[PDB]
PDB file of C-alpha atoms in Angstrom:
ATOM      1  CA  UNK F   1     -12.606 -20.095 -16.393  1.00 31.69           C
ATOM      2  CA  UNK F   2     -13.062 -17.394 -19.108  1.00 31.73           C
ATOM      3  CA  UNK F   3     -10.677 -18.099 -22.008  1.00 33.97           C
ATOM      4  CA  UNK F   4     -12.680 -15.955 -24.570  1.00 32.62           C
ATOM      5  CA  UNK F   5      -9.793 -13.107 -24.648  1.00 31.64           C
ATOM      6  CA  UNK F   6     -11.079 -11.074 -27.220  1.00 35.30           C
ATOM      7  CA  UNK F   7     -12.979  -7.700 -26.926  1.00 34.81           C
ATOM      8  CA  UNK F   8     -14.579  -7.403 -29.893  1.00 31.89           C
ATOM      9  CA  UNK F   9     -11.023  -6.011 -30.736  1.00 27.53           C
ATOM     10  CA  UNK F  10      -8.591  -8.671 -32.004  1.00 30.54           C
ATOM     11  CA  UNK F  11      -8.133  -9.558 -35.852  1.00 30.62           C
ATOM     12  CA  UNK F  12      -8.544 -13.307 -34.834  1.00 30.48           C
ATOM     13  CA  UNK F  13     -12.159 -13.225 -36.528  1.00 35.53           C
ATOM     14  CA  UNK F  14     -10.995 -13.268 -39.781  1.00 33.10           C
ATOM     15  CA  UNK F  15     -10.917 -16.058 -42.713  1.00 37.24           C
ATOM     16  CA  UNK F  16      -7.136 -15.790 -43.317  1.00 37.03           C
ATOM     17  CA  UNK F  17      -6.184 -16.182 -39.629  1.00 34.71           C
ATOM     18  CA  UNK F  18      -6.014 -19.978 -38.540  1.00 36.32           C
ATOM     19  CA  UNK F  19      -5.713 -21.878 -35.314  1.00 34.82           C
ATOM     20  CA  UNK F  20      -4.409 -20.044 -32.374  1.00 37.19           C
ATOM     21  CA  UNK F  21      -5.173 -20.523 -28.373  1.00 34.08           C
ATOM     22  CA  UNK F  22      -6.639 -17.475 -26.531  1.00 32.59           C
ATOM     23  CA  UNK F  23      -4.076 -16.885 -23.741  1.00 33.40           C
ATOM     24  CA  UNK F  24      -3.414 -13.979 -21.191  1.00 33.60           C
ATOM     25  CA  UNK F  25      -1.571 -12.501 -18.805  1.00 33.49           C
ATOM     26  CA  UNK F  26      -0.959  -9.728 -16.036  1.00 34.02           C
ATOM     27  CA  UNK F  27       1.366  -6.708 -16.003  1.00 33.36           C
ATOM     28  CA  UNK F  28       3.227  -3.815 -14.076  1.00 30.29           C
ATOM     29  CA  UNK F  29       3.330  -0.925 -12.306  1.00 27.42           C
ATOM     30  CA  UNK F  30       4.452   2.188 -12.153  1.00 22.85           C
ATOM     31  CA  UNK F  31       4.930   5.270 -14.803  1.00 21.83           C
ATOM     32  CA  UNK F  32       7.437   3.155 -16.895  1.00 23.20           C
ATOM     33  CA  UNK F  33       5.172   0.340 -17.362  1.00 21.22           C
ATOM     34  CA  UNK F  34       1.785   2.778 -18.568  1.00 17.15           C
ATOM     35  CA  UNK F  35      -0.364   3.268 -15.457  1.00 17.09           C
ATOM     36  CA  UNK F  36      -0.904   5.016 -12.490  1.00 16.73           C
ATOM     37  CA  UNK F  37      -1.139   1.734 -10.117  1.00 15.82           C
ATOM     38  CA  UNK F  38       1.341  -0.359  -8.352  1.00 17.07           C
ATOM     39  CA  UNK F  39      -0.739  -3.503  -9.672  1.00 15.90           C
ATOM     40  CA  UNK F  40      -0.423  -6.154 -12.149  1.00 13.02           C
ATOM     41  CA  UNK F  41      -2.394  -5.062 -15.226  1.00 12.62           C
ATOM     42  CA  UNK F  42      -4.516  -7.203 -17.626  1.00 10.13           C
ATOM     43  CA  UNK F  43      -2.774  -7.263 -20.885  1.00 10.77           C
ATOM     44  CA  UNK F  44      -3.684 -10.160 -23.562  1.00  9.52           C
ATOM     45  CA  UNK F  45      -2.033 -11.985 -26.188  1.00 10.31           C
ATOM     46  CA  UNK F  46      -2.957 -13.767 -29.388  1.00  7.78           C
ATOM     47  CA  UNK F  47      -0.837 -15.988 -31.765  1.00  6.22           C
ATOM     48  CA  UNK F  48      -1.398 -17.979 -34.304  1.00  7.70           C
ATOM     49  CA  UNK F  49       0.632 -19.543 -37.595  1.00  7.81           C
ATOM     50  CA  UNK F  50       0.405 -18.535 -41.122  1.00 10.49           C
ATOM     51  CA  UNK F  51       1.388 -19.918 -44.665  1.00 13.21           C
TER      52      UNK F  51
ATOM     53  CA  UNK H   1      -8.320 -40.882  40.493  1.00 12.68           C
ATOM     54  CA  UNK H   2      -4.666 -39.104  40.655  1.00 12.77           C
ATOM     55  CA  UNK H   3      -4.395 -36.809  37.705  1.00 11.73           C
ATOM     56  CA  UNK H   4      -0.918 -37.500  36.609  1.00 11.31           C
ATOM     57  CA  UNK H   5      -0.128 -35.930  33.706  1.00 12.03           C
ATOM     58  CA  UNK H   6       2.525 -36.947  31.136  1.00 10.54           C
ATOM     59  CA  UNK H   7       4.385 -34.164  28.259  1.00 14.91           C
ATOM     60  CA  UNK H   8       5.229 -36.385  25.440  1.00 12.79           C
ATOM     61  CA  UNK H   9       7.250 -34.917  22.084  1.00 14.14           C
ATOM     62  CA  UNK H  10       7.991 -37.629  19.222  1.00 17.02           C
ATOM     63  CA  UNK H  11      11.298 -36.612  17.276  1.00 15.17           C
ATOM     64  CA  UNK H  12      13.486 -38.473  15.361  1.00 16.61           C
ATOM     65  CA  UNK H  13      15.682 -35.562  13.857  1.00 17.10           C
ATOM     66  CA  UNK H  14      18.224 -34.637  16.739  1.00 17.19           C
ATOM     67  CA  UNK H  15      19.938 -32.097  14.806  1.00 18.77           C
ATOM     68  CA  UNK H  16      22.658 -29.484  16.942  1.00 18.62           C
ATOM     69  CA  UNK H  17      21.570 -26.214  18.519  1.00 18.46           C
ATOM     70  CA  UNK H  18      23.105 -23.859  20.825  1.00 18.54           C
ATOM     71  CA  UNK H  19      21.615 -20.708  23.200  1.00 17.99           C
ATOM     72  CA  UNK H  20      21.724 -17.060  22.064  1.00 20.57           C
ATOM     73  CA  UNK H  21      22.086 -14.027  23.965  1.00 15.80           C
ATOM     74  CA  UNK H  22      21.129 -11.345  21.719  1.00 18.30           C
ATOM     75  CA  UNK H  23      22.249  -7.571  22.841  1.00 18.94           C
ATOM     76  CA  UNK H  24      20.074  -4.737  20.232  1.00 20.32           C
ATOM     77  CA  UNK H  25      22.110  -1.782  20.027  1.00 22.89           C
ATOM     78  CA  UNK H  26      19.535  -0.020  21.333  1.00 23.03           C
ATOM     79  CA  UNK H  27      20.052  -1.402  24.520  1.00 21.52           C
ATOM     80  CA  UNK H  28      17.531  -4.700  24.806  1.00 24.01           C
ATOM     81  CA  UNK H  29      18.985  -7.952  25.850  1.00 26.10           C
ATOM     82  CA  UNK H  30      16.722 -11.026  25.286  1.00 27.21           C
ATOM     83  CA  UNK H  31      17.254 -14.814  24.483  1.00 27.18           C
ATOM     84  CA  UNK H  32      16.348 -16.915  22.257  1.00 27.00           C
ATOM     85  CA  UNK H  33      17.067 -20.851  21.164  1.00 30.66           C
ATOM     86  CA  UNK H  34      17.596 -21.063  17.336  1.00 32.16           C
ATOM     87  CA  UNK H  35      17.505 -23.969  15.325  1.00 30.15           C
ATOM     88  CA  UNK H  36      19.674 -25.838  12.631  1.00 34.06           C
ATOM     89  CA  UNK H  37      17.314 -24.737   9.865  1.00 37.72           C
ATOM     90  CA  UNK H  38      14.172 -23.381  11.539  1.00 36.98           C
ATOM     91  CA  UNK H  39      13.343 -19.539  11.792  1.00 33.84           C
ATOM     92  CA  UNK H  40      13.706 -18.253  15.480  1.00 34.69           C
ATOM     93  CA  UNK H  41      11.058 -16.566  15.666  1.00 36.05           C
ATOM     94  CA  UNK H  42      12.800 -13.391  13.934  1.00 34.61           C
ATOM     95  CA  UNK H  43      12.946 -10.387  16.695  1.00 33.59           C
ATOM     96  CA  UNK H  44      12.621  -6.878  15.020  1.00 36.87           C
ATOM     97  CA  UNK H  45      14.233  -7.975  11.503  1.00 38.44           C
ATOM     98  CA  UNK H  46      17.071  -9.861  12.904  1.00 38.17           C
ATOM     99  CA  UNK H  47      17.033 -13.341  11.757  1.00 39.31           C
ATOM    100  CA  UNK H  48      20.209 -15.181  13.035  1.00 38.02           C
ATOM    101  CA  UNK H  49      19.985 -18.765  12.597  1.00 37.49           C
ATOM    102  CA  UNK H  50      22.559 -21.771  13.714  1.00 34.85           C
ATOM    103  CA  UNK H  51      24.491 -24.315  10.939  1.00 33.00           C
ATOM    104  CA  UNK H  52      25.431 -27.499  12.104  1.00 33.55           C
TER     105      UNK H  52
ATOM    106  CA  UNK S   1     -22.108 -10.239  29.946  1.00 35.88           C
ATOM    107  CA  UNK S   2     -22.259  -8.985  26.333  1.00 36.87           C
ATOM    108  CA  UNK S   3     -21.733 -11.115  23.498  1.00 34.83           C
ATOM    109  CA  UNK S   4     -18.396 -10.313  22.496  1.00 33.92           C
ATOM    110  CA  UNK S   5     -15.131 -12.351  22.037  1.00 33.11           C
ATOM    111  CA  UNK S   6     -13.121  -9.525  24.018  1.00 28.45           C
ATOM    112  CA  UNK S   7     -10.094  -7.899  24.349  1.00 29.46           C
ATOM    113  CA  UNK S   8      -8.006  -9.053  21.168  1.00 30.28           C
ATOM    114  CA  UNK S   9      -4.338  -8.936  21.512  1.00 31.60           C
ATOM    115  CA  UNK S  10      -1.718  -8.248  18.610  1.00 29.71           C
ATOM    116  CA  UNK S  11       2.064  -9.227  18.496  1.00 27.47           C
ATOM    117  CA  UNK S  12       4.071  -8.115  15.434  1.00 25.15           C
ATOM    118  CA  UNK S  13       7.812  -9.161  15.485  1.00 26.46           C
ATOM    119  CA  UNK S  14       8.130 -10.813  18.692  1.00 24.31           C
ATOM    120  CA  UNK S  15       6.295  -7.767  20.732  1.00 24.14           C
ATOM    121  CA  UNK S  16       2.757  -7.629  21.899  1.00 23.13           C
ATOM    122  CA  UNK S  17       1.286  -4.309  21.767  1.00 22.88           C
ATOM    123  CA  UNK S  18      -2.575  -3.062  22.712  1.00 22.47           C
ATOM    124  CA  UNK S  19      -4.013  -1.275  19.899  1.00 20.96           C
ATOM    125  CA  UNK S  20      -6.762   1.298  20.646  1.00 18.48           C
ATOM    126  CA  UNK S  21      -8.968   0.632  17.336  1.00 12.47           C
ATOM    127  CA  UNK S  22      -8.268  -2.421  15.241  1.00 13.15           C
ATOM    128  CA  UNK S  23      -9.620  -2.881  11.527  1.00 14.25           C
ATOM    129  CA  UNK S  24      -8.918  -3.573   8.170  1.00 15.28           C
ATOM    130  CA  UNK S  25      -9.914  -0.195   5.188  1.00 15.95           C
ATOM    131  CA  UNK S  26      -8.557   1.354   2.374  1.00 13.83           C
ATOM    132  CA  UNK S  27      -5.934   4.368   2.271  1.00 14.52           C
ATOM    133  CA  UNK S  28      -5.246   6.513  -0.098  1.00 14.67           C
ATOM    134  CA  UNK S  29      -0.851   6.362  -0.725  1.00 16.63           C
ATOM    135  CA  UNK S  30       1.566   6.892  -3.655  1.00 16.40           C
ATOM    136  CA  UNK S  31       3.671   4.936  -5.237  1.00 15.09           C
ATOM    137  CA  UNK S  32       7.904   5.143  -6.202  1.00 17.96           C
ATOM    138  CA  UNK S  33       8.443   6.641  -9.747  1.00 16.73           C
ATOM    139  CA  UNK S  34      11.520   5.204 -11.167  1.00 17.96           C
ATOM    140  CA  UNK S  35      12.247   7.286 -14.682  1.00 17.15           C
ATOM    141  CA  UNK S  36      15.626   5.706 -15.477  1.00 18.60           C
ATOM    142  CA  UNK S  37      15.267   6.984 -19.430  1.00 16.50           C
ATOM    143  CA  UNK S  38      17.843   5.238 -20.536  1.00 18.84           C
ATOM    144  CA  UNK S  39      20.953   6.016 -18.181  1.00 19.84           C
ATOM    145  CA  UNK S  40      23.658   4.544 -20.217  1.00 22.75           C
ATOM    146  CA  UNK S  41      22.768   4.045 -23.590  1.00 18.32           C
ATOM    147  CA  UNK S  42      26.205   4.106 -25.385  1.00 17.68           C
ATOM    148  CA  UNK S  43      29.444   5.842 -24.682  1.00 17.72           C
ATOM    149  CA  UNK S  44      33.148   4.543 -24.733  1.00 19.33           C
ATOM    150  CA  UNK S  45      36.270   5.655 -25.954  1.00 21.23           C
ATOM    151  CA  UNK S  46      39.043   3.534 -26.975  1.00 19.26           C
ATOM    152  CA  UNK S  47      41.353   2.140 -29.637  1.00 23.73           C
ATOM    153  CA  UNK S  48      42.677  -0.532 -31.432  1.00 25.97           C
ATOM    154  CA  UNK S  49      46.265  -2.173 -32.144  1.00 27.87           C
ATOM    155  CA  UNK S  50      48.152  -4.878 -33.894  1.00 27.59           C
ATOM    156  CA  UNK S  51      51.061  -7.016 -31.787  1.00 27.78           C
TER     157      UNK S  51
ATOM    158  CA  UNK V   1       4.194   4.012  -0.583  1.00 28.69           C
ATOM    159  CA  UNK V   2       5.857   7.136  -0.410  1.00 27.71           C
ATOM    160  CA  UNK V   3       3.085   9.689   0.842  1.00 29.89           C
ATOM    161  CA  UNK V   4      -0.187   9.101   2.805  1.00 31.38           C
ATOM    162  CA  UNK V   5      -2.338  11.863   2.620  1.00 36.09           C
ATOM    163  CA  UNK V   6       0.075  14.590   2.262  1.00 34.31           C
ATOM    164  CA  UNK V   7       1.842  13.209   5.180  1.00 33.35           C
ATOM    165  CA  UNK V   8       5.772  12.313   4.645  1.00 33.41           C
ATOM    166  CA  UNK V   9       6.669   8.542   5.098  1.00 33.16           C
ATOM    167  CA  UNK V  10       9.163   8.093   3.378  1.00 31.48           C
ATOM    168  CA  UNK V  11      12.255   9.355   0.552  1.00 31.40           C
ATOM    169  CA  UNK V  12      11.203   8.659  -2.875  1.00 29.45           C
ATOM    170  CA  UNK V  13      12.384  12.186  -4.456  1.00 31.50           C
ATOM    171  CA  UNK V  14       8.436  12.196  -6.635  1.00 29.92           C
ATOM    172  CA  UNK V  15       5.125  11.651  -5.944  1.00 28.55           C
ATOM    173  CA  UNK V  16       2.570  10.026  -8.134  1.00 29.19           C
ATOM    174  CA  UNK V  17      -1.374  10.072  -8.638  1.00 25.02           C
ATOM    175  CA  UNK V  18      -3.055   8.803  -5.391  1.00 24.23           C
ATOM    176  CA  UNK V  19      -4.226   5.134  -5.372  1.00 25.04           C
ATOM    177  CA  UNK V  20      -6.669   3.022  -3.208  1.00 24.44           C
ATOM    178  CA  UNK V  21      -4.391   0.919  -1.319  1.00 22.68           C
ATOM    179  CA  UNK V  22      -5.732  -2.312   0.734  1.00 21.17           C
ATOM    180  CA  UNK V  23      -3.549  -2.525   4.235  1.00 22.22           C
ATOM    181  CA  UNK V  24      -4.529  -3.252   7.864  1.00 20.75           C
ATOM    182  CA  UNK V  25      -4.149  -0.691  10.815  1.00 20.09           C
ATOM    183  CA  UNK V  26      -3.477  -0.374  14.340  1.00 15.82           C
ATOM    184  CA  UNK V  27      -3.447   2.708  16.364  1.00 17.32           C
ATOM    185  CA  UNK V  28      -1.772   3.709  19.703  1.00 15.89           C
ATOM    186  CA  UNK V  29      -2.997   7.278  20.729  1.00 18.80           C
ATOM    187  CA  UNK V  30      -0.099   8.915  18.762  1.00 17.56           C
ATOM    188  CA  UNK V  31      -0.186  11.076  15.266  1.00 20.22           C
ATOM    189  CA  UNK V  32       0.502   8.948  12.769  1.00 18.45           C
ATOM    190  CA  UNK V  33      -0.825   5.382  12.244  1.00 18.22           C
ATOM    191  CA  UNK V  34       1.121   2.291  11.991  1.00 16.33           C
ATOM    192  CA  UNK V  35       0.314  -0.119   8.760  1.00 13.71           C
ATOM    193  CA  UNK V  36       1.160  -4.061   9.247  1.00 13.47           C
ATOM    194  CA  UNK V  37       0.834  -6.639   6.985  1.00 14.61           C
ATOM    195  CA  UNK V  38       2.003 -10.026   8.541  1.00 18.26           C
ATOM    196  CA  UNK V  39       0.624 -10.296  12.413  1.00 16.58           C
ATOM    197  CA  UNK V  40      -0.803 -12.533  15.121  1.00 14.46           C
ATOM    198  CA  UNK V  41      -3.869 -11.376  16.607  1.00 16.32           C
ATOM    199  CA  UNK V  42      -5.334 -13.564  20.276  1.00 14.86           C
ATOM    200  CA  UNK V  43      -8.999 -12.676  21.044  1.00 15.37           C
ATOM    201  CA  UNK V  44      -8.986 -12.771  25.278  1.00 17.65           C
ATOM    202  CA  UNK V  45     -11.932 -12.298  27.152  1.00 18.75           C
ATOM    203  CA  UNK V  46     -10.747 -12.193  30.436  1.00 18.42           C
ATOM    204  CA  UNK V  47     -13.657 -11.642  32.885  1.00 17.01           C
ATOM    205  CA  UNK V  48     -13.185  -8.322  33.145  1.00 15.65           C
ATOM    206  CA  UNK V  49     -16.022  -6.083  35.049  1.00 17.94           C
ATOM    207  CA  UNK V  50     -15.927  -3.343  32.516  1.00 17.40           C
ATOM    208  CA  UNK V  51     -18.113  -5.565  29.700  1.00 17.28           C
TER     209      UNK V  51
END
């Protein structure tokens, strides 16, 4: 159940940022997609709207 | 007192079938009874299925 | 009698086969390394006329 | 998987960092082993005076 996506990394703490929803998802394999493992890798996403 | 046993099988599909002599190239011969739709029970990669 | 289930007995593709040693352990393997690196980018000659 | 311990298994032309790789076994008193993924295993006790 953990939705908090965010490793002390992301520019989502930030006054100017807005609503958004913490999602994620996996990746690839292999030396065209950035590591050394025929697995799905965790890579995470963040969106949100501006004006 | 007997022991008479009955072998009942409920079905209300009756779809066609057929008998299958499979030769490998190898040299193997078996048999096997596909079905009109169901997996056979693939042999060693071959999966040869019957359409009705 | 020991306390054992017994012989176990393995069939993979429609053949049963007696294994010596069965279990279940990690392996070290590679993987397939697919650089493609951009095959066909661009590249065709031809030409253009009026009818 | 391409390579298993310097051991050739298959063609893949390149060989990569080794990686822990979770598979099941079997072995029949040859060299090599023999990985499966999908099988049907029968535990049988069958009296036998040896246990």
């Amino acid at each position: 159940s953990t939705s908090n996506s965010f490793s002390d990394d992301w520019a989502g703490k930030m006054d100017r940022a807005g609503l958004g929803f913490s999602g994620c998802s996996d990746g690839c394999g292999g030396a065209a997609c950035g590591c050394f493992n025929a697995a799905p890798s965790c890579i995470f996403w963040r969106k949100w709207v501006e004006n | 007192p007997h022991g008479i046993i009955w072998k009942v099988s409920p079905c209300a599909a009756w779809v066609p079938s057929a008998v299958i002599e499979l030769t490998m190239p190898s040299g193997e011969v078996r048999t096997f009874h596909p079905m009109s739709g169901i997996p056979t029970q693939v042999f060693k990669g071959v999966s040869v299925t019957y359409l009705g | 009698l020991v306390h054992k289930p017994g012989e176990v007995v393995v069939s993979y593709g429609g053949m049963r086969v007696r294994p010596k040693c069965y279990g279940f352990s990690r392996m070290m393997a590679t993987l397939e390394v697919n650089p493609p690196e951009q095959r066909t980018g661009q590249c065709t000659g031809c030409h253009l006329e009026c009818i | 998987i391409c390579k298993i311990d310097g051991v050739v298994f298959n063609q893949c032309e390149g060989e990569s960092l080794p990686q822990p790789f979770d598979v099941a076994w079997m072995d029949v008193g040859h060299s090599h082993k023999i990985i499966m993924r999908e099988h049907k295993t029968k535990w049988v006790q069958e009296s036998s005076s040896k246990d």
